């Protein structure tokens, strides 16, 4: 039946679009089409941008992409197009269903396509191809243009890639560089769906901000490449965005990128640079927990090679756990539990009481006394006393009560001493961490960077190395020597790129300090130990 139908855009009873190649299998046709499309896109990106951006340039892009593929390459879907085969194709109505909601998503219909294009051109005329405009104006306008192009769906197929190239060249003209590879399939689809359904352009605006701002682009690209899965899901099937400075994000720490952390909020993942968090937070953060992170306007605001850590003061329950870890307390505890088993019949009987001493309640000789005078108060003493009988267990327990009390007193004294020493060590670590290392001066940095190489600057270098030795722990300095960037970043609480920067500058400082010095005036060695 001679007529104009959408079905004529495909081969009969087939998803394969009519093409010049002649291939009918959909798999082979898709593979060939994408293979040629990649080359066409590369060559198009080589070309210089046009003076004006309009519908005609988009048609040129589409034609150059699909010239070898589609007899209708370069022709809008709304315009009825005759095939050389004699058929006539039209696409007045286009719909797609978000699978999440199974709700209709309607593209432009009929001549509305043209209107959109016309409308677009008007904005691309008055707004001077989005040149000379602020960052925010450019983001808003390009988001509107891309969303209107997506809604228009001017070409039966291929409008996604042509839109990508058109926007890339337009931004290039505006001075920005766009990267869509850092855009997950889920994120792009969700932004497009919001725009098409609720006319929410804010997700699209954020997306274009992220792919136009190089720092956010680097953050997202780093996370995408390093991590191949998020929340047990493929990286593509996740909506991931970068954190914007000065805001707050309350989410769930789910994945640890080498230089970033990821927070989940309602299935949307936020990438927070480790370098935008204080070391105390990162040490405190534990994977799986709920967290609240605020993004600073500027890290290294006090430019420092190694940042400070404000060590939180010790918790009471943390004190209890630490003293439980201590091995002297463990030895005293095992002796006490042995005596408790002998006297009462089960160690656990006295455990509650032990816990009291841990919390500085009923502590010291309060329990010991209670053991000697009123052992029955805690529990029945080991053994039985029938008709006033004294079993062997009864005699043994009555003999061991005093040793139990003495062990308890020793345990309390040990707990007190251990707590005091623990507090002192924690304060010493706090003093070490409150130290800071200043960024090497520009001249010192230039010296350190130069490979060939060969006293005021020397004095600055010695001060820098002294700050290093003070701030760093011996273990961390060993990590410096062995170039253990991963564990160094773990210990000091920094991004691994920052950790590598620190390690390299420190190694250069050490070598330069060595080479500057040649003190052979005398070398005191082999001190006299015996006569």
Automatic annotation (TrEMBL):
<dbReference type="InterPro" id="IPR012340">
    <property type="entry name" value="NA-bd_OB-fold"/>
</dbReference>
<keyword id="KW-0067">ATP-binding</keyword>
<dbReference type="Pfam" id="PF18543">
    <property type="entry name" value="ID"/>
</dbReference>
<dbReference type="GO" id="GO:0070733">
    <property type="term" value="F:AMPylase activity"/>
</dbReference>
<dbReference type="InterPro" id="IPR040548">
    <property type="entry name" value="BepA_ID"/>
</dbReference>
<dbReference type="InterPro" id="IPR003812">
    <property type="entry name" value="Fido"/>
</dbReference>
<keyword id="KW-0547">Nucleotide-binding</keyword>
<dbReference type="GO" id="GO:0005524">
    <property type="term" value="F:ATP binding"/>
</dbReference>
<keyword id="KW-0548">Nucleotidyltransferase</keyword>
<protein>
    <recommendedName>
        <fullName>protein adenylyltransferase</fullName>
        <ecNumber>2.7.7.108</ecNumber>
    </recommendedName>
</protein>
<feature type="domain" description="Fido">
    <location>
        <begin position="53"/>
        <end position="210"/>
    </location>
</feature>
<dbReference type="Pfam" id="PF02661">
    <property type="entry name" value="Fic"/>
</dbReference>
<dbReference type="GO" id="GO:0051302">
    <property type="term" value="P:regulation of cell division"/>
</dbReference>
<dbReference type="InterPro" id="IPR036597">
    <property type="entry name" value="Fido-like_dom_sf"/>
</dbReference>
<keyword id="KW-0808">Transferase</keyword>
